[PDB]
Ligand binder design. Structure first.
Ligand SMILES: Nc1ncnc2c1ncn2[C@@H]1O[C@H](COP(=O)(O)OP(=O)(O)OP(O)(O)=S)[C@@H](O)[C@H]1O
Ligand SMILES: Nc1ncnc2c1ncn2[C@@H]1O[C@H](COP(=O)(O)OP(=O)(O)OP(O)(O)=S)[C@@H](O)[C@H]1O
Ligand SMILES: Nc1ncnc2c1ncn2[C@@H]1O[C@H](COP(=O)(O)OP(=O)(O)OP(O)(O)=S)[C@@H](O)[C@H]1O
Ligand SMILES: Nc1ncnc2c1ncn2[C@@H]1O[C@H](COP(=O)(O)OP(=O)(O)O)[C@@H](O)[C@H]1O
Ligand SMILES: [Mg+2]
Ligand SMILES: [Mg+2]
Ligand SMILES: [Mg+2]
Lengths: 340, 327, 319, 254, 335, 258
């Protein structure tokens, strides 16, 4: 029963092993969980719309809230979870969602009311609402407006612009903030201590620095570093270099070579060095980000050069965000910034 | 009980006297109903202006407490096709009331999602059965309605809620709830609403939940800004000043510390800087052209993701290069 | 309240072809046809609210007299008008025996003919061809292109045009005289301006203004009715300086609750139908209005996108 | 609480067959003198109203009325387990989230039990029945079904006209017209086949054939059908049960 | 041949020793293993390394696999036919074998399938539509104790950020020319080839750009022309499409007109009709146009800018020739 | 060669009705002691296995086993000519490209003969039946069909739970939950209605309702159905024939496995 769950969690990757089960495990998204804890004692949970960067804990927060609300018994009877792996057209929204909303709430047991608040409403959550078409979204308007007495709607998305304006107005907007080093160092250190991850001083803070506001990627990188340090068995501590090696970060010397080729060099030398660099597998997004950090941070370039480098890096990132060829985009970016 | 509904649903107007903001249309509709000549209505307006509440209170005032039986209310949640029209709407219009004597009311809420064939079939239902029933079409976009259907109804445009009416509703809510609100906090709340009562009610409930107290204290600007995650005018103007005057590295550091100290979003800062720079009396419009174009491009790129630092540096560089033409 | 009164569009709906203030040529044509008889198959096309359905109704009534009930078959878009209906009911009505005067014929009125399916329209050809001596067909549509060419080849084509200022003014004056309403010249001018050749919309706005304020004045008409959405958009696009267009977009459109989709779409229409500027600059403005659109439809619809669209249009106009 | 045991699950199954298709939501209410149920279609032209007295049950206990709403489709889906001869017991607490249907065979053997989820419906039972109707008539329900099934083919509207000693059903559409004329008569060879008619005023009403077709289903509950017509209200078609009745109120056309 | 000499375990790998050690570290504890995404240049050997890692997570029976068929029904009666590579320890799906129906196959098959878990290898994850990736986003997290994904791709550019975060990222850098030469040496000593001078092998690497799959295939193709005896000046065997692209660039730099644009469109049509992707065509065309010594830096910069623009266009469009002809016309206008 | 004559074409038609729908390809093999046939569905959760001994036929001759595969749909398409009372003879040479079905009426009168094209299927008969199952039970097949038809409406999964003297079928889904509880009992008034149960170990398995629905078809071949369950293998549902049996082996759902 519970022991099987404990063992399955212990044999699970750290992303799912340390998933927040209660509203207190949320480390940084405090403004939303404060309201969620206050409404736990009341019974006026409004329709909610979670939006923010990926890996901020929206799904974990709503799961912990539904748990703390309904208990592990009513967790499976008063919840309608619809993900992006299911059909969510107009037909589905009109039939299934509306039939579940029109239905009455299931009767709680005697053990439920003694430990959990058991609100008189159920919860219908729609994860990854970006893939929902606007007509199927507008179909949900009156469905969530008239049956609010018996069901509550929780939308979850990454881009709040993909959801129509009426739905965004009907739901309370909860913006999840990026999890940088400051507001996630406590959670990362807790995960490291619970797994006996022996690292150096500036490793964890560096990991989140590579994560760029993503605790899931940081936990995955920490798990990979711990596995790589346990395989060696040397008993030493994990270093920031070993972490940034497996995180896809280009070494500093290779980036300085690119800066030298951009500063001094013609089209042919730059093209040859780019062709050689693309042989070693590096993500073009990470290279663009590192070049942006170097160029904007270095206090040795003119402001007129800085405006142009910022606009060129922005254009290159916008083009790379569409599935383009990394080699062509990187070569074009380096050539355009070399003419400056 | 009504104490379980959210504040958006709990405070839904039940009478025409509780619908604030709309005065020129509310008085005209009241006169239409009192004098008897109620034509086919077309309530066009943005979300959260009070069109559904207005028509519900109107049907309540017309038919009484039995509104839910003497009125045919169809919406996008219900299947609205051409056959649905042909059967249901025509059978409702051709027949009479089962509870009393009088004209009928068909409320086609959110009728901007109806098929073109459905509207083509309904435009002759509205013109044929016009002595025993009426039609009310609610819309947010007037381009999704055919011109033939658009010409058969009297159009009423629901303007966004002004300051006086939204403050009156806020005072009504603060009377109904054991809650106090600061004047500057109220002004900041009205600023982040754009005439949307739903947003105001939602964030008011959320900041009441944020209070953490038995509500013996007041709600200040800090509570509102920390609960809605919206940037403050102080940090907004500080970032704008550091971008316009200070150095590139210093501007980058200022933007980073501002967006990381309160967890602010880059899109909110972009919109705030756009709103602030709209009052700037500037030179030759080339700077404004470049600024608007680059800011809209960066906003459209943010709407799809990417590197937040790269986009922030892009915003800084765009504003700087746009203002470099003003010299 | 217990009951309502009939609207002025339905109450004062013309019942004789002389009361129609539409296109004089086609009106006198239909009047002479009803006087002499031998009504041929016809297709009346035009724009909504100019007197197309009323015209054919008056023609059928005057041509059939008391036999209108059993000699006229009305089929609107609200009724099923598929292949099965054309096969069974229309054919049974055309084959039906009926003793009529030696100058009249059975009339099949088909309202909204542009919505009939291709199969029904194809089946109607021989249906109207084999019984063209005892059954006549009158189609009323808004787009004559939606009706197949074989059907148009067997009938006359009557294209109704917009109603000039004089005709709508005369009809409104007749209605005011028949209703004893207090009015003024500027109020009627504003009504006709907001009507845009739409007689039905004009009468509806007049009745609404009367029942809402009593006096038909330009102030009342403007406070109850909206200045033609397209005209403010045209004045915004035709602005010479960027700040003027921005202030117009802010105050007239954005501060009054007009959605961004309506603004951009109305904007596209205004441009397409523009004639002040050249073709190439119009195409560039349409391109900018449309690239923006592509962003408006993706959910990025805000004021900044419309401001950037206006800035790009001005940059194109900036030589 | 709700505790109603039907001798034969078949009776309840036929009753629900009557609400079937023509309505989606049904509001039941059990009380000291029995069970009632009402359902109105979306267009609000048809009301289905049921009444089952205490005596129609093999066992009925009620010390506290319970009102419960449910989806008709869900109910019928479950209503084919009665074996017809099975015993059926409807069970629910005073504040139910579900309704329990318990089918059992005589012997302890097989017990099929269902727990149907309920819907919340604003309690608002209508009381539209009239004191006097313009005309009243009863005739075998199988005959009424045939009359409806005949005419239905011709039109979407079937007119019922009543004059002294004459009842006439008429349909007229595309392919032509049809009519069925019946006359009152007492058959002593078996009065369940008689056709009675009491006319206080001639009536002439038109009904949508699609609805009359829904109504004829009641034949399975009673040998005769009573039809009450008025120019002032919805028509009443009634099928009597042993201690009870199933009623269909249908609003005439224009 | 490429297939006759291929490593089957982690100890049989012969390049990227750090990557082999990282894979051994990741396979030391196989049950607490997150999802993996192998990214890098095409032809590096990531598909062999994933199977070698599976050979460490499970028994040697992972290579004994079978091909089955599964049918799917879309919203209409069009039947989607998809073949599946299955093994008693893992299964492989390639959603790049159909059109916009990747989401249906992904969701249904993965839900049906969902040591103790069964591995899933998604081949060519770049062809996965955004809707299929969104559908897989929550399937990756809901079933993490029964299904582990090993997605093989050549560039994480079209992969969405949620999927990137939901799995570990493993880069596979192309092997150095020296390692390629050492591998070709063992191959030619095992296949009994005659080399007059060893340096030719190096040149093979210099003609493959890190690609081992292309290197071995070209070595074997030129070994059949030299009759199993490679000389000091054996010609380099280039694929036909590369020669067509080179002739196209020669035509471009020689003549810039609409009459030549017609035959350029004809060549593009003939290339696209023979199962050649348009992105690779554009990449090779641009890279070989930059190699033209007749042009200057001003021409090459405009060429690379137009190629990036039209690559974005092609990634946002479906009619590939509509973008290829536009890029060719823009290059003609530039020169 | 294959030479098997059924007294009544009806028996063969009902047998094939059992493979019908749930499987597409069937592999038959006739031999000295009778005919066997196996068919596995695409997802491999259901195996349909038939055995007809020599005595079930009116005439059977086999001096050389023949294995033949065919499309089930093609076979049933042809399997409605038996008049049920017609005589049916299955015929095939030692290396067949077809299978001949010959229906004849008593008198020489009418002779319907078919020549069905065969499919080549790699011969690989499975032998997954267990020595002992955790629990064994038999009950009237019409009763089992009703039990399955009841619960099916509620869910895509029907759980079978066995404890001492108790058999319980359960379904739980969207509209609610249902259960059918039966108890062992000997009816002497006619033992074909009894419900037997031998439990060596309590069992609790879940099956996909769509599959149980395919299986209930066997009611038409036998009055009773035997159900054998184990936590170690596919469940066995068996319908006895006079000299023979039709068996359905169904893999329990793992959590999601039909
Ligand atoms: N605030 C947080 N506190 C603790 N752990 C967190 C937090 N946010 C994310 N995590 C970890 O990251 C895992 C993923 O959480 P999710 O809620 O699925 O992230 P996400 O916001 O849903 O990203 P998506 O699904 O791509 S939009 C959790 O199981 C935790 O292990
Ligand atoms: N004028 C108003 N006065 C008071 N409350 C209002 C007003 N307008 C909106 N509200 C509040 O906002 C809620 C939603 O109003 P609705 O009428 O549903 O919005 P809407 O105008 O119909 O726009 P939609 O539904 O998105 S198209 C109401 O229940 C009120 O609580
Ligand atoms: N020429 C006219 N003279 C007088 N009243 C008119 C005239 N044209 C329209 N009207 C008024 O407008 C009402 C509706 O006219 P219709 O003929 O139905 O409009 P329409 O030209 O057919 O366009 P549709 O029906 O939208 S395609 C009539 O009942 C009259 O009250
Ligand atoms: N460790 C290795 N040592 C030697 N040759 C290898 C090794 N791994 C892969 N190869 C070979 O190098 C080539 C790489 O191409 P390919 O196998 O298509 O790459 P991928 O595995 O990424 O699809 C093939 O010929 C492959 O067999
Ligand atoms: Mg999520
Ligand atoms: Mg509304
Ligand atoms: Mg008309």
């Amino acid at each position: 029963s519970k022991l099987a769950a404990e063992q399955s969690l212990a044999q699970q990757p750290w992303v799912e092993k340390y998933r927040p089960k209660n509203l207190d495990e949320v480390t940084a998204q405090d403004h939303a969980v404060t309201v969620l804890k206050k409404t736990l004692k009341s019974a006026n949970l409004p329709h909610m719309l979670f939006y923010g960067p990926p890996g901020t804990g929206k799904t974990s927060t709503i799961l912990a809230l539904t748990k703390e609300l309904y208990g592990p018994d009513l967790m499976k009877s008063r919840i309608l979870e619809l993900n992006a792996s299911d059909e969510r057209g107009i037909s589905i929204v009109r039939e299934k969602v509306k039939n579940f909303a029109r239905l009455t709430v299931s009767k709680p047991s005697k053990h439920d009311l003694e430990n959990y608040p058991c609100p008189p409403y159920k919860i219908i959550i729609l994860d990854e609402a970006d893939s929902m078409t606007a007509d199927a979204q507008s179909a949900l308007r009156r469905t969530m407006e008239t049956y609010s007495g018996v069901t509550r709607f929780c939308l979850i998305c990454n881009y709040v612009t993909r959801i129509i304006d009426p739905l965004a107005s009907r739901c309370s907007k909860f913006r999840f903030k990026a999890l940088d080093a400051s507001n996630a160092i406590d959670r990362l250190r807790f995960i490291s201590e619970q797994e006996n991850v022996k690292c150096d001083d500036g490793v964890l803070e560096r990991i989140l620095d590579i994560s760029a506001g993503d605790l899931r990627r940081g936990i995955t990188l920490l798990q990979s570093a711990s596995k790589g340090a346990q395989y060696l068995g040397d008993g030493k501590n994990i270093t920031s270099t070993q972490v940034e090696e497996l995180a896809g970060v280009v070494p500093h010397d290779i980036l300085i070579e690119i800066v030298e080729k951009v500063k001094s060099g013609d089209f042919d030398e730059i093209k040859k060095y780019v062709n050689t660099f693309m042989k070693s597998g590096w993500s073009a997004a990470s290279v663009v980000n590192q070049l942006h950090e170097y160029y904007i941070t270095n206090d040795n370039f003119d402001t007129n050069f800085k405006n142009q480098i910022s606009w060129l890096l922005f254009t290159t990132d916008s083009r790379l965000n569409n599935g383009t060829n990394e080699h062509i985009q990187l070569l074009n970016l380096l050539v355009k910034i070399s003419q400056l | 009980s009504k104490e379980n509904l959210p504040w958006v649903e709990k405070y839904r107007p039940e009478t025409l006297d509780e619908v604030y903001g709309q005065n020129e249309v509310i008085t005209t509709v009241r006169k239409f109903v009192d004098e008897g000549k109620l034509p086919h209505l077309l309530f066009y307006g943005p979300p959260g202006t009070g069109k559904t509440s207005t028509i519900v209170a109107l049907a309540r005032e017309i038919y009484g407490k039995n509104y839910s039986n003497m009125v045919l209310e169809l919406n996008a949640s219900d299947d609205r096709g051409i056959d649905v029209v042909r059967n249901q709407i025509k059978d409702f219009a051709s027949t009479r009331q089962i509870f009393s004597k009088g004209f009928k009311l068909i409320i086609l809420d959110e009728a901007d999602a109806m098929t073109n064939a459905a509207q083509n079939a309904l435009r002759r239902v509205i013109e044929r059965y016009t002595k025993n029933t009426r039609f009310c079409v609610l819309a947010n976009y007037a381009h999704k309605l055919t011109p033939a259907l658009l010409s058969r109804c009297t159009r009423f445009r629901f303007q966004p809620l002004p300051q006086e009416a939204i403050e009156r509703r806020i005072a009504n809510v603060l009377v109904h709830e054991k809650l106090k609100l600061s004047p500057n906090a109220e002004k900041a709340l009205i600023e982040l609403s754009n005439g949307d009562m739903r947003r105001v009610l939602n964030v008011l409930q959320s900041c009441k939940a944020t209070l953490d107290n038995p509500d013996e204290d007041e709600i200040s600007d800090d509570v509102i800004y920390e609960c809605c995650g919206a940037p403050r005018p102080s940090d907004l103007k500080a970032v704008l000043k550091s971008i316009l005057e200070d150095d590139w590295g210093t501007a980058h550091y200022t933007l980073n510390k501002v967006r990381s100290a309160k967890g602010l979003a880059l899109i909110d800062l972009i919109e705030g800087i756009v709103k602030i720079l709209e009052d700037y009396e500037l030179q030759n419009e080339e700077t404004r052209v470049h600024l608007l174009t680059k800011l809209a491009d960066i906003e459209y790129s943010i709407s799809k993701g990417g590197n937040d630092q790269i986009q922030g540096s892009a915003v800084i560089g765009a504003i700087k290069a746009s203002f470099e033409n003003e010299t | 309240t217990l009951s309502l009164q009939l609207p002025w569009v339905e109450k004062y709906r013309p019942q004789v072809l002389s009361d129609i203030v539409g296109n004089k040529e086609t009106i006198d044509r239909l009047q002479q046809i009803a006087k002499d008889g031998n009504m041929p198959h016809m297709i009346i096309s035009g724009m909504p609210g100019i007197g197309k359905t009323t015209s054919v109704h008056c023609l059928a009534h005057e041509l059939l007299g008391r036999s209108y009930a059993d000699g006229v078959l009305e089929l609107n878009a609200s009724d099923d008008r598929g292949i099965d209906v054309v096969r069974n009911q229309i054919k049974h009505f055309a084959q039906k025996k009926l003793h009529l005067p030696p100058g009249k014929h059975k009339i099949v009125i088909l309202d909204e003919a542009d919505s009939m399916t291709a199969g029904a329209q194809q089946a109607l050809r021989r249906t109207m061809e084999l019984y063209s001596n005892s059954t006549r067909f009158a189609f009323a549509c808004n787009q004559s292109n939606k009706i197949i060419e074989p059907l148009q080849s067997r009938c006359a084509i009557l294209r109704y045009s917009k109603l000039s200022d004089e005709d709508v003014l005369k009809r409104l004056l007749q209605i005011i005289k028949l209703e004893d309403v207090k009015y003024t010249n500027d109020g009627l001018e504003a009504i006709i301006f907001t009507a845009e050749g739409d007689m039905r919309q004009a009468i509806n706005n007049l009745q609404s203004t009367v029942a809402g304020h009593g006096l038909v004045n330009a102030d009342n008409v403007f406070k109850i009715v909206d200045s033609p959405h397209p005209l403010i958009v045209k004045k915004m696009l035709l602005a010479s300086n960027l700040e003027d267009s921005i202030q117009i977009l802010r105050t007239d459109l954005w501060k009054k609750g007009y959605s961004s989709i309506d603004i951009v779409t109305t904007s596209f229409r205004v441009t397409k139908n523009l004639a002040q500027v050249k073709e190439s600059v119009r195409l560039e403005m349409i391109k900018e209005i449309g690239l923006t659109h592509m962003r408006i439809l993706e959910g990025v619809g805000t004021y900044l996108q419309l401001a950037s669209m206006l800035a790009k249009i001005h940059k194109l106009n900036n030589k | 609480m709700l505790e109603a045991k039907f001798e034969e699950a078949s009776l309840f199954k036929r009753i629900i067959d009557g609400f079937k298709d023509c309505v989606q939501l049904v509001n039941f209410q059990c009380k000291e003198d029995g069970i009632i149920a009402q359902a109105v279609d979306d267009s609000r032209v048809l009301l289905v109203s049921l009444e089952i007295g205490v005596e129609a049950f093999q066992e009925y206990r009620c010390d506290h009325p319970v009102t419960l709403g449910m989806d008709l489709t869900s109910l019928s889906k479950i209503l084919r387990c009665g074996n017809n001869t099975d015993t059926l017991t409807l069970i629910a607490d005073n504040t139910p989230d579900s309704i329990i249907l318990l089918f059992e065979d005589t012997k302890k053997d097989r017990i099929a039990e269902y727990s149907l989820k309920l819907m919340d419906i604003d309690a608002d039972f209508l009381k539209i029945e009239e004191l006097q109707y313009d005309s009243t008539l009863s005739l075998p329900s199988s005959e009424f079904s045939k009359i409806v099934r005949d005419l239905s083919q011709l039109s979407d509207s079937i007119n019922i006209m009543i004059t002294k000693e004459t009842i006439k059903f008429v349909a007229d559409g595309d392919i032509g017209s049809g009519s069925v004329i019946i006359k009152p008569f007492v058959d002593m060879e078996h009065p369940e086949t008689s056709i009675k008619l009491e006319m206080d005023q001639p009536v002439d009403l038109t009904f949508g054939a699609k609805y009359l077709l829904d109504i004829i289903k009641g034949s399975s509950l009673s040998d005769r059908v009573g039809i009450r017509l008025s120019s002032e209200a919805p028509a009443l078609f009634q099928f009597d049960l042993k201690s009870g009745f199933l009623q269909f109120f249908l609003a005439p056309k224009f | 041949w490429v297939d006759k000499y291929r490593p089957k375990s982690l100890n049989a790998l012969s390049h990227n020793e750090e990557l082999t050690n990282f894979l051994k570290s990741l396979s030391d504890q196989p049950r607490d293993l997150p999802h993996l995404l192998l990214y890098g240049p095409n032809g590096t050997g990531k598909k062999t390394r994933c199977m070698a890692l599976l050979e460490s997570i499970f028994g040697p029976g992972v290579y004994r696999l079978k091909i089955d068929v599964r049918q799917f029904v879309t919203a209409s009666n069009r039947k989607l036919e998809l073949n599946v590579v299955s093994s008693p320890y893992h299964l492989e799906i390639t959603p790049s074998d159909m059109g916009n129906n990747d989401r249906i196959v992904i969701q249904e098959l993965l839900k049906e399938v969902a040591h103790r878990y069964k591995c899933v290898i998604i081949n060519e994850a770049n062809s996965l539509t955004k809707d299929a990736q969104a559908a897989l986003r929550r399937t990756m997290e809901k079933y993490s104790k029964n299904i582990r994904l090993i997605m093989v791709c050549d560039s994480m550019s079209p992969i969405i950020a949620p999927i990137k975060s939901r799995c570990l990222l493993i880069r596979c850098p192309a092997p150095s020319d020296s390692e390629i030469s050492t591998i070709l040496s063992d191959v030619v000593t095992n296949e009994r080839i005659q080399l007059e001078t060893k340096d030719i092998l190096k040149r093979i690497a210099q003609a493959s750009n890190g690609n081992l799959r292309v290197s071995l295939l070209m070595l074997e193709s030129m070994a059949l022309n030299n009759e199993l005896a490679l000389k000091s000046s054996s010609p380099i065997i280039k694929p036909d499409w590369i020669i067509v692209i080179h002739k196209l660039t020669r035509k471009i730099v020689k003549e810039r007109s609409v009459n030549s644009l017609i035959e350029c469109r004809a060549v593009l049509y003939d290339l696209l009709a023979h199962c050649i992707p348009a992105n690779i065509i554009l990449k090779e065309l641009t890279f070989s146009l930059l190699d033209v010594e007749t042009l200057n830096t001003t021409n090459k910069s405009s060429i690379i800018e137009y190629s990036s623009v039209f690559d974005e266009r092609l990634s946002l469009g479906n009619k590939a020739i509509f973008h290829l002809e536009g890029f060719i016309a823009k290059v003609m206008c530039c020169l």
